[PDB]
Amino acid sequence: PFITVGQENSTSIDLYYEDHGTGTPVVLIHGFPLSGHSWERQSAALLDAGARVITYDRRGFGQSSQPTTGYDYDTFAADLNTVLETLDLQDAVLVGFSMGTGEVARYVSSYGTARIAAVAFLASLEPFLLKTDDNPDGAAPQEFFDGIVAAVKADRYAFYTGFFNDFYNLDENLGTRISEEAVRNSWNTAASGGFFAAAAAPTTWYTDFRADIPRIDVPALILHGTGDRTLPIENTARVFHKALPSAEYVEVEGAPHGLLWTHAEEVNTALLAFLAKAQEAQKQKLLTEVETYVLSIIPSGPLKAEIAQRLEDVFAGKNTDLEVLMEWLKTRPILSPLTKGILGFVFTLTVPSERGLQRRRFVQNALNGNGDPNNMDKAVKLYRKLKREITFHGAKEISLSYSAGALASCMGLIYNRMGAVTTEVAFGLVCATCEQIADSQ
Amino acid sequence: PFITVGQENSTSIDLYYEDHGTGTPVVLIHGFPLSGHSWERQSAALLDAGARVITYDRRGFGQSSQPTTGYDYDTFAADLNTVLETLDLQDAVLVGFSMGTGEVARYVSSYGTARIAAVAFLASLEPFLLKTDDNPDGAAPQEFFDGIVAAVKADRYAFYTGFFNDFYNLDENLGTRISEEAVRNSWNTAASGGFFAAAAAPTTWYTDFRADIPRIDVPALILHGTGDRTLPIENTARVFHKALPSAEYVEVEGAPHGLLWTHAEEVNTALLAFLAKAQEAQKQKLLTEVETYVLSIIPSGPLKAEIAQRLEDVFAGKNTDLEVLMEWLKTRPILSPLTKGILGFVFTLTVPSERGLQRRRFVQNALNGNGDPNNMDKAVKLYRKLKREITFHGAKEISLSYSAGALASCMGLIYNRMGAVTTEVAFGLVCATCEQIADSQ
Amino acid sequence: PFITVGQENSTSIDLYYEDHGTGTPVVLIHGFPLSGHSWERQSAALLDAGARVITYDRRGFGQSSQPTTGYDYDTFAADLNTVLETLDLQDAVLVGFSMGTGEVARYVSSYGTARIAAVAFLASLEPFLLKTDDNPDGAAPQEFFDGIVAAVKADRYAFYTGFFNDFYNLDENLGTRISEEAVRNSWNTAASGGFFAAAAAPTTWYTDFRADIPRIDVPALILHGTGDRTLPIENTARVFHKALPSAEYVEVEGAPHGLLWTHAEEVNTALLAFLAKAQEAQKQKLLTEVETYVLSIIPSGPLKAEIAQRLEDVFAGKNTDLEVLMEWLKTRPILSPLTKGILGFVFTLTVPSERGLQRRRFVQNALNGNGDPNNMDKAVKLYRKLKREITFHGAKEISLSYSAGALASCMGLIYNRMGAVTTEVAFGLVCATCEQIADSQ
Amino acid sequence: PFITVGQENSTSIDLYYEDHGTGTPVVLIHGFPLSGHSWERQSAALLDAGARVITYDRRGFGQSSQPTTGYDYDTFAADLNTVLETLDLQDAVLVGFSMGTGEVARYVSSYGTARIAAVAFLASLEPFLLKTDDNPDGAAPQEFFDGIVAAVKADRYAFYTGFFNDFYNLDENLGTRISEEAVRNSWNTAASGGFFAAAAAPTTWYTDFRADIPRIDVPALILHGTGDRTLPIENTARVFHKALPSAEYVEVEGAPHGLLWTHAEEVNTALLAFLAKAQEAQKQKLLTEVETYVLSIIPSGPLKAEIAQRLEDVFAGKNTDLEVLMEWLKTRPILSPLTKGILGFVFTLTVPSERGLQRRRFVQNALNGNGDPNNMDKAVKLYRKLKREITFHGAKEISLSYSAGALASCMGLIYNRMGAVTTEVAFGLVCATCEQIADSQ
């Protein structure tokens, strides 16, 4: 798969990307000189843990186009921007490794955290690698980087070999934490990047990210290997944490630069924990928003108390007997049959286990759009559009452009499994409906 | 409710009718001088036993119009014809009491038994009541009937009193089998019929039904009270059974003419038995027709053997574990997903108990019309028409005018309970689908 | 007259109704096994007292259709809903007797009191008749009701006789408060209801109305006969008043269940006085509703004090010399000619006697829409619609969709008697105008 | 080149495929963890032998997309279906190696053999690899496969190394039948497949193909290496042949799993001979198909004997003197000029050598559509469509939608070389014509 990010002469500039799983989106931004596939140990864990995994190959690397332009962090951040906008990612986690940590800082800094729930920096460049008068903690002098450029231009093929040596601490880790075959694959991946990008990349490494850091808005993780020969932990992660005290901070004891493979565990467990903390809060946010919309249609009173208590309990995960819940709703006075259908729908959708219970007649009758063909026609039209939605707000926005009869019919269509959409999209549908109905009062 | 059967001068002639319950249609044709409501003891039993009950008031009686024309059995049979055609009754049972038995014979005779599964004659006029040279078994001379006409014209109000006396054997049955209040209601009903019809009705009683009897095509019941003072069992039921040996024949010991009330039990039990014998055969006919259509889409082989065996068993009433059945279908090789969906649908529809099993994903996916909006649009259109159908063939006929994609989508719509139709109509839908699919091969 | 409330097989379900008089609508809902005509003593009094009287026959009774479906209070309340919506009743009083009191509670509870000014419960079922563990005050055990069903199915004709005995306390009241002929008419009415409804009705009698009662929003009357043998006052009216302390409560000393006839007097007198109170409250509400709108366009100050005092006085019924009033308005400084015209209009409309005073030039000039033909064109269009309105809010709603110039012109049209509308509709017109004008400020 | 088979989140799922040569289509389905390019030894031989070679990369392998969904044989068979339908393959040979043999069985089983002339199974999975109670001949227990999954997830890179060891019997074959460089290319190909597919593939290996085998309709070949360490010949090919006795069966003595490279020879020779047999059978079928249609228009008799003998002889390859043949036809009595033209056309088309003979006037005159412009107009329209056809039946189907005059004119157009179509398409044209003409009789 490709996303086009620009044009170079007669050719467009396309980034290779992958898009796996379902759930909260996690975007992984690889390091030099590798590709999105270098995250494969992390991707597997995130997929098992229930996240949507997005990887892409930076321009000049892996399967992306290989221009001779745009090798700088503003372009790289603009590239990332295009990806996020193209996929309409909401509530995303951005995880960068090495070079990738430059994208994370520069994007957050320039474009803000509108789509972004949390960030993570692994084997970071930050805050500035260039050793100057005003930057004493810098890791190396300018002449040092000039050196790498010269070395890559001389042979890049040979260069990759010595690079992966220190990248992986092969003198320590070969035959132990990394196989000879895994290293061979890495070299092949590097050899496959563009010649121009290979020599141009090292010039972006001493980008000054010092003014980007105060812009970091959302929860952050900083993770570094203490045996990092490529980015000395003392000039990078340790001074970065002083600049962002707020960041959660993890040192991987004796881990090299290429800790994604050698210490995938410690990485994946820690990354997993970070996702886990981010994910539950996001889920809670989703649950409570739904609740306000659902409650907005119910008349104020003690019933509205019983209903809200029940929502909150199933939302907290207390598996309730849906059969008991549904009978209660069914037999509630005052509530309109429409209202009971909406609640009926919400509860079956959110309850931990449906326990093989059949659909309820009172709900099917409540959500049938009065069996009106125009309602049903529009509901089918909305359904088509909702299949393309992946977020709560996108779903809710498109739904609000339809009449309440059509919305109720659409809900029946999903309820009865005549169509299927993602959970968060279904929430947006029922919330648009509640919004429309509440507004009629 | 009314059915218009003709015109008299500036006014139309409308028959009052009622239409209760669901299931096999049973049409009750009342006696003189009462209305459709005189069947109320029988209607209750038939409704409990699970039949569709149709009653109507003969022209000049009860709540029907009161013309001064058309008091003869050809008109009465034409009236009945209009009712049956207006309601599109298929596979109907015609039950006549007294005068009503004239309609049954004359309709069958002239119009044939196309809509008619069985007939029943209770307290029959048949075969001819007029005592002549060629009709020695006749119950009375012409002068006798001339007498009744004269008596009704003189006072009809007073006349009804002495009539209900012998009609009910009140000297035997009052305070015992019939209450004084029940008799009062009968007189009120009679007093409410038209003056002209009251005097004209008795002229139709010695209609010669002798040539109508050989036309009786379908299973018949003859039932008479041996204490019938109004229609002597010896000139009516006993000579009628000789003319139709084939008829099932029941004498109600010491039962009067008005045995529907006084002996409702013996009547309702016997009538019930007759319905019960008719109903099971009709059900078997419905089951086996469905089976041929369902089997027509399956490739010939051992699987087709296993499938047919299973249909036949559930059709015979062996409650099978639908969960077991569905898993088996689901996991069957060779069968197309479409075919599996159709069978999936049929089995859930015909199985005695669904045991609260959720709908199956493999069926929902199989019957979704490829999620195509035009299919779904037509399926919703068909659904509207099917809601108005009550028979298997009417349903199947209208369904065959739709494409297979639309038919499959309609089936999904019913499967998923987004709409509801009667069982026999649903069978017609799935059979039209099978017919269309088979024809494509 | 009929209102269609549903469909049963080939027949629609139609309710027989009557619609008499003019004025505030009062809807009377009869008891078992009688019809709308059982209210005839009450109807006459309400008609003389100047109300619009609506009666209808519950499904299965009187002249309504006699289905074998929908014998439950949600359907009965839905039936009532259809009636109220079909006639567009605003500000209605709902009066139920016996079974009818179930409709009143269930409709108010489910559909709310939007159309409803007040409610009245006569010989009530409330709050629950079934004697259970949780309902100790219940009047009878389940087996008792099962008994009535069995009795009606056995003979209903005979059944009605013993029923009217206790219904009317005939051992006390025959030849005294009820004639033998009045009782005969009652039995005839009952005998005329559907057989199925007769047996199905008693199953609805122990409906639990306990959750409906807190929903009663509007002023209520509870009225019961202390000699009620059918609904023991101790298990019904007395525990109902504890549940609704707010209700006005009247015991009719030694009155039977059928107190509508036996004690029509005591009944009419409580009903009419209570209705009168409700009417006066409605009038006061209208005065505040008209007065607030009228005052909203006047600048705050002492004049606004003089004006408000005057409105209130004419509204209270102090017949004022309109000639004096008009001269005063005419000669008032500060007030715009438009404002003076609106007040001019209001006063001539509300003053007890116009005393044959001619229309005023200052008002005609003020309400002429500037003699603009488009204003006048729209005013004539609005007028057409207002002729079809009967309520203040309906009139006001449609009026607000027109511009102020057109509204003022319409008012002139009425003022000048070039058209005519009902008083409350005229109020809605002038209030819409005031609302539009006030909003411009 | 790509064929799109589905959608995963924001990305479509595309299969990389290649399409080489001309002639009968042969579709090669690769094994794990390789791609369509692994058939290169076989492709070269098939191309030289004159076949159309189709290869594609299974989802997750080679150059195909790398989803995290659809790793099961129904999806894989659906993928294959899409390929076959997309290219409109008729009369195709399906050849599977290892994993690929699962596609062949499952597609044939579910979708039938409409497009399929013959099948071949090389180093087969069949019939079931899982060792169970009911499957005693199974090659391994479930825990064994669970093991491979775990091994791939641990390192896949390192894993491929030990895998190719046993895949190729490198301890036997390295430096001999397979070079070190050929093995290096294989590892590179594997390393290039998706991480997720690599771990998910081994779960599809113990799919039960036992119910698929009876569905195999068409001529089959089973071929296995007796030195197969990956799929023990005793649990796979040997028990498979018992299940399909009908299959032609070839053991490659001491050949490993990766016999496509190590024993390409023995492989190509069995494949080509078997293909040749299938080709000859197809040709015979075509001859009967053409010949029967051609004979259907000739009157029964001795001439029809001479004609049929001649067809059969040229069809068998006896190069006949077309000049002699044509003169004979030309001078035949009884035969219509139309019939003579059709035969004239067939013979010049099928004769081995035309020997530079000019077109015949009798044929040009016979196939000129009576020089009618509408015939000729339609014939030109048909011609356009026939240029797009590649099969006998597709050609014949489209041709039958044209009138006989237009069909004859089209044939003249081809005869006279005013247009050109492939041989089999031309056969379809002349057969449609014969069918139309025969039907007129």
Helix (H) or strand (E) holding C119: strand C116-122
Å from A19 to nearest chain D CA? 6
Which residues does chain D have within 8 Å of residue A19's beta carbon, measured at their own beta carbons? 8-11
Residue indicated by tokens 């497009």 = D115
- Read off the DSSP letter of residue C130: B
Reference B122, options B4, B266, B282, B277; nearest CA is: B266
Active site residues of D: 98, 228, 257
Q: Rg of the Cα trace of chain A?
A: 26
Cβ(C30)–Cβ(C190) below 8 Å: no
Half-sphere exposure of B26 (CA within 13 A, CB side): 28
Cβ(A141)–Cβ(A131) below 8 Å: yes
Cβ separation C109–A333 shorter than 8 A: yes
Neighbours of chain A (3+ CB pairs under 8 A): B, C, D
Q: Which of B358, B361, B418 sits opposite A368 (nearest CB)?
A: B418
Nearest-10 crossing angle of helices C157-168, C180-191: 140
- Read off the DSSP letter of residue C213: G
Q: How far apart (Å, rounded) are the C-alpha atoms in residues D397 and D401?
A: 7
Cβ separation C9–B52 shorter than 8 A: yes
Q: D198 to each of A66, A190, D59, D160, D259, how far by Cα in Å?
A: 28, 22, 11, 10, 21
**Burial status of residue D353 (CB atoms within 10 A of its CB: 0-12, 13-18, 19 or more):** exposed
Cβ(D168)–Cβ(D262) below 8 Å: yes
Encode D185-208 in three state secondary structure: HHHHHHHCCCHHHHHHHHHHCCCC
Q: Which of D9, D191, D199 sits opposite A188 (nearest CB)?
A: D191
Whether chain A lies against chain D with 3 or more Cβ pairs closer than 8 A is: yes
CB of A181 within 8 Å of a chain D CB? The answer is yes
CB of B385 within 8 Å of a chain A CB? The answer is no
Q: Which of A22, A182, A390 sits opposite D157 (nearest CB)?
A: A182
CB of D158 within 8 Å of a chain B CB? The answer is no
CB of B365 within 8 Å of a chain D CB? The answer is no
Whether chain B lies against chain C with 3 or more Cβ pairs closer than 8 A is: yes
Q: Look at the alpha carbons of C283, C284, C285, C289 in this order and tell me if their dihedral is positive or negative.
A: positive
- Beta-sheet pairing, B248-252 with A220-225: unpaired
Which DSSP string do the residues of B116-130 spell out, in sequence order?
Answer: EEEEEEES---S--B
Token readout for A76 is 């790289």
Chain centre distance of CA C107? 14
Report the helix count and the strand count for chain C, using DSSP H and E.
19, 8
Token readout for B381 is 């259109």
CB of B312 within 8 Å of a chain A CB? The answer is no
Query: Quick check: helix, strand or coil at residue A334?
Result: coil
CB of A1 within 8 Å of a chain D CB? The answer is yes
- Beta-sheet pairing, D116-122 with B11-20: unpaired
Strand C25-29: give its sheet, edge to edge. Answer: C2-8, C11-20, C52-56, C25-29, C92-97, C116-122, C220-225, C248-252
Nearest-10 crossing angle of helices A337-350, A264-295: 170
Torsion angle, CA of C300/C303/C304/C305, rounded to 10 degrees?
120
CB of A283 within 8 Å of a chain B CB? The answer is no
Torsion angle, CA of D314/D317/D323/D329, rounded to 10 degrees?
0
Torsion angle, CA of C277/C280/C282/C285, rounded to 10 degrees?
-130
Cβ(C236)–Cβ(C125) below 8 Å: yes
**Burial status of residue D355 (CB atoms within 10 A of its CB: 0-12, 13-18, 19 or more):** exposed
Q: CB atoms < 10 A from the CB of A269, how many?
A: 13
Q: CB atoms < 10 A from the CB of C372, how many?
A: 14
- Beta-sheet pairing, C220-225 with C248-252: parallel
Provide the strand spans (E) within D159-243.
220-225
Cβ(A367)–Cβ(A409) below 8 Å: yes
Output C139-144 pairs: Cβ under 8 A, ≥24 positions apart.
C139/C231, C139/C232, C139/C235, C139/C236, C140/C206, C142/C206
Cβ(A124)–Cβ(A222) below 8 Å: yes
Which residues does chain D have within 8 Å of residue B333's beta carbon, measured at their own beta carbons? 109-110, 211-212, 215
Q: How far apart (Å, rounded) are the C-alpha atoms in residues D75 and D5?
A: 10
| Helix boundaries (H) for D29-99 | 40-48, 73-87
Residues within 8 A of B (CB atoms), D 192-211 only: 211
Beta bridge partners of D140: D130
> What residue of D is the nearest CA neighbor of B303?
D211
**Residue among D2, D7, D9, D180 with most chain A CBs within 10 A, to mutate:** D9
Å from B364 to nearest chain A CA? 7
- Read off the DSSP letter of residue C19: E
Q: What are phi and psi of B122, to 5 degrees?
A: -120, 125
Report the phi/psi class of residue B349: left, alpha or beta, with left for phi > 0 and alpha for psi in -120 to 50: alpha
Cβ separation D157–A185 shorter than 8 A: yes
- Read off the DSSP letter of residue D213: G
Query: Quick check: helix, strand or coil at residue A412?
Result: helix
Q: How many CB pairs under 8 A join A and D?
A: 50
Reference C410, options C387, C370, C364, C376; nearest CA is: C376
Cβ(B148)–Cβ(B167) below 8 Å: no
CB of D68 within 8 Å of a chain A CB? The answer is yes
Which residues does chain A have within 8 Å of residue C102's beta carbon, measured at their own beta carbons? none
Residues within 8 A of A (CB atoms), D 77-116 only: none
Cβ(D345)–Cβ(D363) below 8 Å: yes
CB of D7 within 8 Å of a chain A CB? The answer is no
Query: Quick check: helix, strand or coil at residue D391?
Result: coil
Q: Which of A20, A86, A179 sits opposite D68 (nearest CB)?
A: A20
CB of B333 within 8 Å of a chain D CB? The answer is yes
Å from C76 to nearest chain A CA? 15
- Beta-sheet pairing, D11-20 with D52-56: antiparallel
CA angle C121, C127, C133 (to 5 degrees): 165
Which residues does chain A have within 8 Å of residue D66's beta carbon, measured at their own beta carbons? 18
Cβ(A167)–Cβ(A256) below 8 Å: yes
- Peptide bond between residue A25 and the one before it cis (omega within 30 degrees of 0): no
Å from B417 to nearest chain A CA? 7
Active site residues of B: 98, 228, 257
Q: B183 to each of A383, B198, B395, how far by Cα in Å?
A: 64, 18, 45
Cβ separation A181–D161 shorter than 8 A: yes
Experimental determination approach used = X-ray
Output C81-88 pairs: Cβ under 8 A, ≥24 positions apart.
C81/C107, C81/C111, C82/C3, C82/C5, C83/C3, C83/C5, C83/C15, C83/C17, C83/C27, C83/C54, C83/C56, C84/C27, C84/C115, C86/C3, C87/C19, C87/C25, C87/C54, C88/C390, C88/C391, C88/C394
Q: How far apart (Å, rounded) are the C-alpha atoms in residues C19 and C37?
A: 12
Cβ(A375)–Cβ(A411) below 8 Å: no
What is the per-residue burial (b if ≥16 Cβ within 10 Å, else e) of D342-351?
bbbbbbbbbb
- Peptide bond between residue A245 and the one before it cis (omega within 30 degrees of 0): no
Q: How far apart (Å, rounded) are the C-alpha atoms in residues A118 and D172?
A: 55
CB of A365 within 8 Å of a chain C CB? The answer is no
Active site residues of A: 98, 228, 257
Q: How far apart (Å, rounded) are the C-alpha atoms in residues C382 and C386?
A: 6
Å from B6 to nearest chain D CA? 54
Q: Spot the catalytic one: C30, C224, C241, C257.
A: C257
Which residues does chain C have within 8 Å of residue A336's beta carbon, measured at their own beta carbons? 110
In sequence order, the 6+-apart residues with CB closer than 8 A to the CB of B63 are B16, B35, B57
Chain centre distance of CA D407? 30
CB of D238 within 8 Å of a chain B CB? The answer is no
**Burial status of residue D181 (CB atoms within 10 A of its CB: 0-12, 13-18, 19 or more):** exposed
Chain centre distance of CA A83? 12
Q: Spot the catalytic one: C98, C186, C399, C409.
A: C98
Beta bridge partners of A93: A26, A118
Beta bridge partners of B251: B224
Cβ(D284)–Cβ(D425) below 8 Å: no
- Read off the DSSP letter of residue C191: H
Neighbours of chain D (3+ CB pairs under 8 A): A, B
Å from C110 to nearest chain A CA? 5
Q: How far apart (Å, rounded) are the C-alpha atoms in residues B2 and B63?
A: 9
Cβ separation D68–A37 shorter than 8 A: no
Reference C122, options C256, C212, C219; nearest CA is: C256
**Residue among A16, A34, A178, A179 with most chain D CBs within 10 A, to mutate:** A179
